[PDB]
Amino acid sequence: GKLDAFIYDAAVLNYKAGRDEGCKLVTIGSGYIFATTGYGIALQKGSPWKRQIDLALLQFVGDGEMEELETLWLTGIC
Amino acid sequence: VPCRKFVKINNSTNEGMNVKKCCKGFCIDILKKLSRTVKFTYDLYLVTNGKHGKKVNNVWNGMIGEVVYQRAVMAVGSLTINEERSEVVDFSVPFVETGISVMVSFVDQVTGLSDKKFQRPHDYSPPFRFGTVPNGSTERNIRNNYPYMHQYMTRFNQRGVEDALVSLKTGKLDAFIYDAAVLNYKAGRDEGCKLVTIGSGYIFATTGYGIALQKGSPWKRQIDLALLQFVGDGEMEELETLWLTGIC
Amino acid sequence: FCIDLLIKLARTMNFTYEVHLVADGKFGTQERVNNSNKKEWNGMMGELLSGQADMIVAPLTINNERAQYIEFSKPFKYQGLTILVKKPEERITGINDPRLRNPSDKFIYATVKQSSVDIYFRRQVELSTMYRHMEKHNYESAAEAIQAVRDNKLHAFIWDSAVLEFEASQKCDLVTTGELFFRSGFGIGMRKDSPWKQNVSLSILKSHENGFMEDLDKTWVRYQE
C-alpha cells in the first residue's frame, strides 16, 4: 500500500500478474488508451544481416513456433 | 512418406504392379523421429500376402514371413506379442500400454473375462453374439485360453473392423473383442458415442506394442535406447495428443 | 508380490536363490565420488555392479540412462504417475497446474531422495523450478512421505499409480489425481549379456499370457476392503 498505481510496460505486468499469489493487482484493459507499440531488433545503419533476420522472424511467427514460445513463457491466468 | 504395394491386375495371372502411394499416421511419425535421431535409411513398403502372421503348418505369412525369411528387416507397424512370435524373432521394448477390450453398446453389463455371459448364451434370455477378426492373434489367444470359447465363436465370426462397427451401430452384432486403444480412438471420433468401452484393461490381456527385429540385429540396442528417449521426454505424449482424442 | 514372482520363476526353472536387502532406501543415482572426479553408482545398482548381487528383483524404473549400462528384461508392471492428496480445488490435475509451475511455501510437494523420478525430471529441461523446489524436502522413504501427508504436513507427492491405489483401498482419505502421465513399465533389474536373460524373459511372458497376472491381482491388486 505504499503506492496506488504504477505506469510500466504491458506484457511484463501481464506476466507478473499471471504468476502473482492470489492475483490481487488488476491490469487495465489491453492497451486501448495506451501507446500499444512493439519490440523489434536494433541493427546498425547499413548492416547486411537485416534481411535474413527479418526472414527468420517471419518464419518463426508464420508457423506457430512463436505462439509455442509465448505459451511456454507466458501464462494468462486470472 | 512414399510406399509401394505389389497389387495384382487379374486373378488368372500372378503379374502385378508396384503401385506407389502416400503414408501418414502414428508409426510413420515414429519412423520419422527414428530417422531424425538414429540417422539411418529406411525402405518402407506394404505387405501383399495379408495380415500380421499365422503359422500354417510350420509356414508363416505376411510380415512374419518377410522378417523370418529375411526379405525385410523390421516392422515399424503395430504387432501383438505372444510366445511363438518371441520364439521366431526378437522384439524390442514396448512403448504404449495397449491391452485388449470388448466393445458393447453409467451402467455396465460385462465386468471382464470372468463374466457369467462367457459360459453359455442360453443362460441369458436374449441370445447374444460376439466375435473377432479372422486370421488374428486374438483368436490364438482365445484358443490358448478357452477352446470352448473358440467353438462358440466359430458360429460368431465376421469379416471387417469397419464391418463389425457398422454391425454394432445398426444391431447386427452385440459385442466385439479387439484391442483397447484402437477402439478408444474409434469411439473418440464417432458421432453419437452410443458404443461404450468396458473398463481400462483390468481383467484383460494388458500387453504392449513392440518392434520385431531379426535374431542378432545390431540395431536392437539403439532402438531400445531411442524408444526410451522418445517416451522419457513427453514427445510420445505429444504424439498421443496428436493421434488420440480423449473425450469425456 | 515379487517374492511370489520369484516363487513362480523357481517353479518354472529349477534354480535356488539368496534373498537379501539393499543397505539403504534409495534406488541409486549417478553421483560424483569425492576424489579424482569419477562417476559412481550406489544403492541397488551400486550393490549389483560390485558383484555382491546377482539379480535385482524390484519395480525398476526403466529409463534411457540405465539401459546404456545394463540390459533390461520385459516389464511385468504397466502403470503411470499420480499425485497423493488428502480429502475449493482439492485436486491438482497433474503437472499443468500453473501454481505448481511457480510454487511457494504453501503447496509443499516433493519426492523420494535419489529417485529415478528426479532423474526423469532432470531430463526435463523446462521444469527446473520444480527441481530446485523439491530438493529442500526430499525424504528417505515413501512411507515417510505417507506419514508426513497423514499429519497434513505435505500437499502433493508424485508416485506410481497402483501403489497409491492400493493405499487408497486401505485408507479412504488417501486420494489420487485424475490424470495418467508417464505410462511406463516396471521389470526385473538384470546384468549384461548372460544366459539368465532369454529363458527368464520367456518365463515372464508365460506368466503374462496365462491368468497368473490375474492371480497376482487376486492376491493384492483386485483385493479391496
From Swiss-Prot, chain A:
Which cysteines form disulfides? Answer: 23-78
Q: Tell me which residues bind L-glutamate.
A: 9
Tissues/organs with expression: Detected in brain cortex, olfactory bulb, hippocampus including the dentate gyrus, striatum, thalamus, superior colliculus, inferior colliculus, midbrain and cerebellum (at protein level). Detected in brain cortex, hypothalamus and cerebellum.
Subcellular location(s): the record lists: Cell projection, Dendritic spine; Cell membrane; Synapse; Postsynaptic cell membrane
Going by the entry's taxonomy, the superkingdom of the source organism is recorded as Eukaryota
Coiled-coil ranges (or none): none
Name the family the entry cites.
Answer: Belongs to the glutamate-gated ion channel (TC 1.A.10.1) family. NR2A/GRIN2A subfamily.
Q: What's the domain remark here?
A: Contains an N-terminal domain, a ligand-binding domain and a transmembrane domain. Agonist binding to the extracellular ligand-binding domains triggers channel gating. A hydrophobic region that gives rise to the prediction of a transmembrane span does not cross the membrane, but is part of a discontinuously helical region that dips into the membrane and is probably part of the pore and of the selectivity filter.
Primary role: Component of N-methyl-D-aspartate (NMDA) receptors (NMDARs) that function as heterotetrameric, ligand-gated cation channels with high calcium permeability and voltage-dependent block by Mg(2+). NMDARs participate in synaptic plasticity for learning and memory formation by contributing to the slow phase of excitatory postsynaptic current, long-term synaptic potentiation, and learning.
Subunit arrangement? Answer: Heterotetramer. Forms heterotetrameric channels composed of two GluN1/zeta subunits (GRIN1), and two identical GluN2/epsilon subunits (GRIN2A, GRIN2B, GRIN2C or GRIN2D) or GluN3 subunits (GRIN3A or GRIN3B) (in vitro). Can also form heterotetrameric channels that contain at least two GluN1 subunits and at least two different GluN2 subunits (or a combination of one GluN2 and one GluN3 subunits) (in vitro). In vivo, the subunit composition may depend on the expression levels of the different subunits. Found in a complex with GRIN1, GRIN3A and PPP2CB. Found in a complex with GRIN1 and GRIN3B.
Write the protein's name: Glutamate receptor ionotropic, NMDA 2A
Gene this chain is encoded by: Grin2a
Q: Which residues of the full protein are shown?
A: 723 to 800 of 1464
Curated annotation (Swiss-Prot), chain C:
How this protein is processed and modified after translation, per its record? NMDA is probably regulated by C-terminal phosphorylation of an isoform of NR1 by PKC. Its phosphorylated state is influenced by the formation of the NMDAR-PPP2CB complex and the NMDAR channel activity.
Coiled coil stretches, renumbered? none
The glycosylation sites annotated in the UniProt record are 14, 34, 102, 199
Give the residues the record marks as binding glycine.
59, 61, 66, 116, 160
Q: In which tissues is it expressed?
A: Detected throughout the brain, in brain cortex, cerebellum, thalamus and olfactory bulb.
Q: Where in the cell?
A: Cell membrane; Postsynaptic cell membrane; Synaptic cell membrane; Postsynaptic density membrane
Q: Which residues lie on this side of the membrane: Extracellular?
A: 88-225
State the family named in the UniProt similarity comment for this chain: Belongs to the glutamate-gated ion channel (TC 1.A.10.1) family. NR1/GRIN1 subfamily.
Job of this protein: Component of N-methyl-D-aspartate (NMDA) receptors (NMDARs) that function as heterotetrameric, ligand-gated cation channels with high calcium permeability and voltage-dependent block by Mg(2+). NMDARs participate in synaptic plasticity for learning and memory formation by contributing to the long-term potentiation (LTP). Channel activation requires binding of the neurotransmitter L-glutamate to the GluN2 subunit, glycine or D-serine binding to the GluN1 subunit, plus membrane depolarization to eliminate channel inhibition by Mg(2+).
Q: How does it assemble?
A: Heterotetramer; the NMDAR subunits are modular and harbor tiered domains that function in concert to regulate opening and closing of the cation-selective ion channel pore. Forms heterotetrameric channels composed of two GluN1/zeta subunits (GRIN1), and two identical GluN2/epsilon subunits (GRIN2A, GRIN2B, GRIN2C or GRIN2D) or GluN3 subunits (GRIN3A or GRIN3B) (in vitro). Can also form heterotetrameric channels that contain at least two GluN1 subunits and at least two different GluN2 subunits (or a combination of one GluN2 and one GluN3 subunits) (in vitro).
Print the domain comment field: A hydrophobic region that gives rise to the prediction of a transmembrane span does not cross the membrane, but is part of a discontinuously helical region that dips into the membrane and is probably part of the pore and of the selectivity filter. The extracellular N-terminal domain (ATD) is a site of allosteric regulation to modulate overall receptor function.
Record protein name field: Glutamate receptor ionotropic, NMDA 1
Q: What is the lineage of its organism?
A: Eukaryota, Metazoa, Chordata, Craniata, Vertebrata
The part of the entire sequence present here spans 458 to 797 of 938
